[PDB]
Design a protein around this ligand. Structure first.
Ligand SMILES: N#Cc1ccc(S(=O)(=O)NC[C@H]2O[C@H](O)[C@H](NC(=O)c3cccc(-c4ccccc4)c3)[C@@H](O)[C@@H]2O)cc1
Ligand SMILES: N#Cc1ccc(S(=O)(=O)NC[C@H]2O[C@H](O)[C@H](NC(=O)c3cccc(-c4ccccc4)c3)[C@@H](O)[C@@H]2O)cc1
Length: 895
């Protein structure tokens, strides 16, 4: 009953969950004030970059050194880290003392002392001939510009040493070590005690993204995304922030929470108006905060018969330790009586249950405020990872939480209410920031080892100028043997004659039909040509689908259906009754004997239509046109789609002798001298050749460039060992190469935390449109993370950087090999004519050339560098697939 009198007296120190969640919202604004460039100089929560770029993943290994300077004594530590799967850290340390002589003395004397102790420790500890990282955690206020550079703002706890404040403490420890000359030190890291706590816990639990200390002081750190950290340059990846939240409220943002006892401790402190959040929650001030509630209640005659004692009025005489005791004993109000008597009072039972209760109120308020600001931190980690349910572990240290009986549990229960959208685990750190500082340099080496590891794989996909010139000539060599009559049949690149013998001039006019047929949906095309200067080409299409009934039926039914569509189209343009010549794009394997004769070899892509294979496709087509009555169309020619792409850029540019398509497929064509084409009789004139160059390398001629990933794609394709040059440069394949690289890294622990999604094992997930967005993303790489979340993969910042890099390397090699092939073509076009300076144009189509951000560029420079004499322009075509078929006809019609 004295209880509810107490609670009604202390009502403003019992905080509703509502108040806590409004404190979280305030703290989140304070976090954003510190992270932002313009608001940070006046921000009370300093949000200091720590330069730690990663938590531990567990595979760290090595030997490391550490210093902990807390003052009047420091420790020198040695941490053995073994990757055996146990994650069991081996430690040794020693304390040594800095006496007032050195302490109040000069800076360089102070560090010469420290450098000596370190060497005395390495001497005792065996290791002094080893060059090891350090390892540096000291808590005095600092301005930290680098992992290895931190400036002393001021001293604390009795350090007067001159020449230190405003001077880099790493330069001081390093210069001292040079002066001794007996040992040497590797990379240094300067790490705050919370960051140390996070790091050491994260070596056991790799979900630990928050360090926490409720000590005599209180502070917390978390992992944070570089896009939100204005004070450090770059938006990629994440970095740990030292929040310094003890200073929360220094500008008065908590003054409606803070009671008068809170006011009075601030005035009685060493640092008035500083660290007000600490002074509410933490160990130094917590028992003192009970002292004042006792003093004032007794001055009001609600306790002790209005009577005081000289000890009750001395600051510090009622201690945090006295709270832990009173709340911890079975009989708490006897241990209360005992503590009160020690202070010179004669308590009653009601005086003791009152003192007991005030203790719970103060200690519960401390654990609740922590929850509040832990709630804001948890909340932001949630929004950054961007999923609804969160697993995150908090490493925790400090004497309040470890040694006070109920506070850890209260914190656990309160945090978990305040954030129901989280599964949160707490893990206490024992050996403290001695381990932690060391572990920061272990992770620093791990990141390096892994970076070099995965950059050593990506070198196999990086080709030299000399490697490309080799494949350039392996292209020519294997072009020649396709033209000559002997070797054509053994030849992977068949160099098939197109029977397209003449390119445009300004003369052509009139309307032409075009039929682009492959796969289940064709298009019918009307193409109108305007001759003369200016003018150009005008196109109308319509798309039709071949019913599933029709392609599992007879072959004549297939082409009647096709002809109904042609008849529907030109009646849709309003031409019904008009007869026109027709160009024809048929993409199936075909031996083409004439320009208007081509024999279907084998059906593909799900056409079962009978009576077709082994037949000339144009006869089938016009035998189907004959049938329709009254319907007459002249079928002039049939073409490979590359040939069309080139002829399409023949009308823009007089000089275009070369088609190219880097598509879902890849192929290329030039006009070769009739001299050199040995399967067609006669030497007079020139002839366009359909290279079918995606087959470059199916004899093995590329097999020394082919990485295991190229072979992984090759072996699980529908056409194993066929079309290899295609599978390096285009289409479905590059995503698959990327995917197999990623799988490789992840098996090696180099990506995705070692863990392969079943969703990562799914073929085809990386589509060329996604590689295009990936490689065109920059800065924070939020577009890569989105895509990765879209495909069901881990979206973390660090994994984006790699995925982006793997993509860029795969796509570069693709353009580069594509230039080296296109360079062979333009050089032999020179060598056929004995010419040297040669100006050429390449019409180009296909999905990846137009839409990939860097690909068109990279290939341009590749053929400039590999074919120095040729001057090569590339003109984009746009649907030379079907439109080129009509335009091959208009030139054919000119004869
Ligand atoms: N001197 C101490 C000390 C260390 C550890 C402990 S402790 O280990 O017992 N508690 C952990 C936390 O205590 C304090 O809040 C520390 N901040 C401050 O005292 C403080 C106070 C005012 C300003 C700045 C500042 C300013 C600029 C840059 C860095 C720091 C820091 C915080 O850095 C530490 O992480 C206890 C006491
Ligand atoms: N089916 C398709 C298709 C069509 C267009 C596209 S595409 O329009 O996206 N790219 C254009 C190029 O793709 C591939 O290289 C094509 N080669 C083959 O299909 C191929 C594949 C294997 C063997 C032989 C062969 C070899 C010797 C003789 C005859 C034929 C040809 C090529 O005809 C086309 O020039 C993508 C895919």
């Amino acid at each position: 009953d004295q209880v509810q009198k107490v609670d009604q007296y202390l009502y403003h120190m019992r905080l509703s969950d509502e108040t806590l969640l409004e404190i979280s919202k305030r703290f989140r604004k304070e976090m954003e004030k510190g992270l932002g460039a313009t608001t940070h100089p006046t921000a009370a929560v300093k949000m200091l970059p720590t330069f730690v770029r990663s938590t531990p993943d567990g595979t760290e290994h090595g030997e490391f050194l550490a210093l902990d300077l807390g003052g009047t004594n420091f420790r020198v530590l040695w941490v053995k880290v073994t990757d055996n799967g146990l994650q069991k850290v081996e430690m040794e340390n020693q304390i040594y003392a800095i006496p007032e002589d050195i302490m109040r003395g000069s800076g360089t004397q102070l560090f010469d002392h420290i450098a000596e102790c370190l060497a005395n420790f390495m001497d005792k500890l065996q290791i002094k001939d080893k060059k090891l990282p350090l390892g540096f955690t000291f808590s005095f206020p600092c301005h930290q510009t680098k992992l290895d550079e931190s400036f002393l703002v001021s001293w604390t706890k009795g350090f007067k040493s001159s020449g230190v404040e405003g001077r880099d403490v790493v330069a001081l420890i390093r210069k001292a070590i040079q002066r001794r000359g007996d040992f040497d030190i590797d990379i240094v890291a300067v790490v705050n005690d919370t960051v140390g706590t996070m790091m050491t816990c994260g070596y056991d639990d790799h979900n630990c993204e928050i360090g926490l200390i409720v000590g005599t002081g209180s502070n917390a750190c978390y992992m944070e995304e570089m896009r939100h950290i204005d004070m450090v340059e770059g938006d990629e990846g994440r970095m740990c922030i030292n929040m310094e939240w003890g200073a929360f409220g220094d500008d008065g943002s908590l003054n409606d929470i803070r009671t008068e006892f809170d006011q009075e401790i601030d005035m009685g402190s060493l640092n008035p108006g500083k660290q007000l959040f600490e002074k509410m929650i933490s160990g130094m001030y917590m028992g003192e905060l009970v002292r004042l509630i006792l003093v004032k209640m007794a001055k009001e005659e609600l306790l002790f018969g209005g009577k005081l004692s000289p000890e009750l009025l001395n600051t510090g005489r009622f201690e945090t330790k006295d709270i832990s005791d009173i709340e911890g004993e079975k009989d708490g109000i006897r241990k209360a009586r005992e503590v009160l008597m020690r202070l010179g009072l004669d308590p009653t039972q009601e005086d003791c249950v009152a003192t007991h209760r005030i203790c719970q109120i103060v200690s519960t308020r401390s654990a609740s405020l922590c929850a509040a600001t832990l709630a804001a931190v948890l909340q932001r980690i949630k929004e950054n990872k961007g999923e609804e349910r969160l697993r995150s572990t908090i490493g925790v240290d400090g004497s309040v939480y470890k040694k006070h009986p109920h506070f850890a549990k209260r914190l656990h229960k309160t945090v978990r209410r305040l954030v129901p959208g989280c599964d949160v685990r707490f893990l206490r750190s024992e050996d403290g920031s001695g381990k932690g500082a060391a572990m920061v340099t272990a992770v620093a080496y791990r990141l390096a080892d892994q970076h070099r590891a995965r950059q050593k794989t990506l070198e196999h996909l990086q080709l030299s100028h000399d490697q490309l010139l080799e494949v350039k000539r392996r292209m020519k060599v294997e072009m020649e043997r396709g033209l000559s009559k002997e070797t054509h049949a053994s030849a992977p690149v068949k160099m098939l004659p197109t029977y397209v013998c003449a390119t445009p001039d300004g003369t052509e006019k009139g309307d032409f039909l075009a039929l682009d047929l492959g796969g289940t949906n064709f298009r019918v095309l009307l193409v109108r040509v305007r001759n003369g200067k200016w003018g150009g080409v005008e196109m109308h299409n319509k798309i039709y689908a071949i019913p599933q009934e029709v392609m599992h039926g007879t072959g004549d039914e297939l082409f009647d259906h096709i002809v109904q569509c042609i008849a529907d189209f030109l009646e849709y343009m309003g031409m019904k009754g008009v007869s026109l010549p027709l160009g024809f794009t048929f993409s199936f394997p075909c031996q083409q004997n004439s320009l208007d004769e081509s024999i279907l070899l084998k059906w593909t892509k799900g056409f079962k239509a009978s009576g077709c294979e082994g037949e000339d496709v144009v006869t089938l087509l016009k035998e189907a046109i004959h049938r329709r009555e009254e319907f007459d169309l002249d079928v002039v020619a049939v073409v490979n789609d590359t040939v069309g792409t080139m002829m399409t850029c023949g009308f823009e540019d007089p000089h275009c002798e070369v088609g190219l398509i880097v598509g879902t497929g890849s192929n290329a064509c030039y006009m070769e001298e009739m001299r050199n084409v040995e399967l067609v009789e006669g030497e007079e004139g020139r002839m366009c050749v359909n290279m079918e160059w995606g087959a470059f390398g199916d004899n093995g001629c590329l097999d020394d460039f082919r990485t295991e990933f190229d072979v992984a794609v090759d072996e699980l394709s529908l056409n194993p060992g066929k079309q290899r040059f295609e599978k390096m440069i285009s289409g479905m394949y590059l995503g698959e190469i990327v995917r197999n690289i990623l799988i490789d890294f992840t098996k090696r622990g180099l990506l995705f935390r070692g863990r392969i999604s079943e969703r990562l094992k799914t073929r085809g997930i990386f589509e060329t449109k996604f590689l295009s967005q990936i490689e065109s993303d920059c800065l924070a790489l939020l577009q890569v993370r989105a895509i990765l979340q879209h495909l069901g993969l881990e979206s973390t910042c660090d994994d984006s950087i790699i995925v982006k890099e793997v993509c860029t390397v795969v796509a570069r090699r693709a353009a580069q090999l594509c230039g080296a092939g296109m360079a062979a073509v333009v050089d032999r076009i020179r060598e056929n004519r004995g010419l040297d300076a040669l100006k050429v144009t390449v019409g180009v189509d296909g999905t990846l050339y137009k839409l990939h951000p860097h690909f068109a560029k990279v290939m341009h420079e590749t053929v400039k560098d590999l074919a120095p004499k040729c001057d090569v322009s590339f003109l984009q075509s746009e649907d030379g697939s079907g439109k080129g078929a009509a335009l091959i006809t208009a030139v054919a019609c000119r004869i």
